[PDB]
Amino acid sequence: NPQDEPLHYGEVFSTWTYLSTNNGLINGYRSFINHTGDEDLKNLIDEAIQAMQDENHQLEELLRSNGVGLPPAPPDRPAARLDDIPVGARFNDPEISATISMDVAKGLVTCSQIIGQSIREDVALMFSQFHMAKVQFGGKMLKLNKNKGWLIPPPLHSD
Amino acid sequence: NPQDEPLHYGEVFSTWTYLSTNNGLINGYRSFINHTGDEDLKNLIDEAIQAMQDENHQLEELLRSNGVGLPPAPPDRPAARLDDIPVGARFNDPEISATISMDVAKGLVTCSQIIGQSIREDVALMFSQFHMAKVQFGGKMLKLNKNKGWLIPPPLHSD
Amino acid sequence: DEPLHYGEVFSTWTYLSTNNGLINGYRSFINHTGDEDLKNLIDEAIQAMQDENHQLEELLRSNGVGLPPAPPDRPAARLDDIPVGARFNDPEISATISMDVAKGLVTCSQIIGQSIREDVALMFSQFHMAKVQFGGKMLKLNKNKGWLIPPPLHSD
Amino acid sequence: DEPLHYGEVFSTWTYLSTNNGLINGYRSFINHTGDEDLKNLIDEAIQAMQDENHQLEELLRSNGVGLPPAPPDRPAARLDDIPVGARFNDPEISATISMDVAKGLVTCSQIIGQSIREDVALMFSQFHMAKVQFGGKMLKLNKNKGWLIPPPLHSD
């Protein structure tokens, strides 16, 4: 029974940190919903928020069951009208999408790091599942960026 | 003469990507200046922007001298009044600071990655210098977060 | 039909090169191994990397990229012929491989996240899943053999 | 006076453990090495890790954290006594160490970025600088010896 073994310090710190990262990203993405015009991007931000909330439910149960204090999360946000945001304070759709895409890429790496350092099998499996879901979400972001013409092409190999 | 040798594909992609990352962060941080109340945080955001612009000058010269196309950067931003930002669109000081601190930590890692994969000595040395500066800036961010009471304490070891 | 980007080429060429190096190293480790449960897992790792390499070599060759050098043939050796100071012991070998697998998970995720060509992202997502399963087998071996060094433990 | 956080303890204990493993492995590599310029650099790496380890063991001991096991004594061996299939050759050894150094740079940066205690950040910033210099020596060796495999090159 994996959950009758203690977590190690790395497992505790990494999962606590991941949960805190999610809390911060939920808050930022809730702000991005208010800054976004594009409805396709908005839908994906909403999906990301929900996905992180699902991850959080599992993480919080893990930490609560193992006597680890939870990190404080920023609160939910009011709605705002897009046209009321001063231009200099406004995040635009391509840059919102870029940010989220980079966040997803970083999250893939963090999942792999946690799996690699895990000794409790349940922790490894949780992050394996998170990684599988995040690969799919990342693929949706790439499709969006392609469809919208937001992707900046890097230097290309000539065959 | 290092600069008479061709860059390898990794050096090109990594430096191009780093420059693009800087361009995006400059744009986001210019928006954060408009969202910030705290003058100490504002000063550090301004310092970060200037530091990235200095890095960019070197990166752009490297790429321009080696026949690599530069990534397009978002433009500069107008000033905005803090009180005109709808609450639901507003980024608050602790969360701005957290974001920048995470960005700095990620940048340290990216610098080390580039140094490690470098074969041209000038590329390794450039990133070594960037890393040294970024360590100092990161230490200033930590001091800020401590001073302001913005740092969330992680689980602590009991000796 | 879309070209690979510089990062896709560099990352895939480097991952292939890494596998080639690890196949050579692990072939040597097989000659240093006493424990046959460990040996069987090294064999599995080698075959898996060889399987990945067929896919990567095809991708690179089909896109006009020169391949890194293949692993050389390596003969068997008798464990007992290895001088003591030159011998890697079973827990040392296991720790090395375990660390290599953990690193490789991270590399796969890095490649996925920087890929624009969907076929590259797909390939490395499949490699990642395989490495998750393999790392899981290594962990079970290390626990079963008593080779794992416990890190600092949280107390609930 | 401030306690270490869980990440500081886990990261420092793990970095120490890693150094201990690499000291053992590199001692073995010395016995496999023909080239004396390579051997001298392995000796330098070992001594450097030992120097880091004195600092880390003190930090951990002073904060009530149990230390990981120290490297065991490892005798010398004659290169010519190593069966061919068990022998790591000079370029293989060099590639391994070069990769270890690159990984170690990244680990140092990771520890710096997650540190809250200034003394931990300072320590790893100093280790990082040392590894930058050492990796630079490894690269020069690999170039001088003709061991570097060129990756795909950009054309200006």
From TrEMBL, chains A, B:
It comes from the Bacteria. InterPro entries: DUF3231 (IPR021617), Ferritin-like (IPR012347). It holds the Pfam family DUF3231. The lineage of its organism: Bacteria, Bacillati, Bacillota, Bacilli, Bacillales. It comes from Halalkalibacterium halodurans (strain ATCC BAA-125 / DSM 18197 / FERM 7344 / JCM 9153 / C-125). This is BH2358 protein.
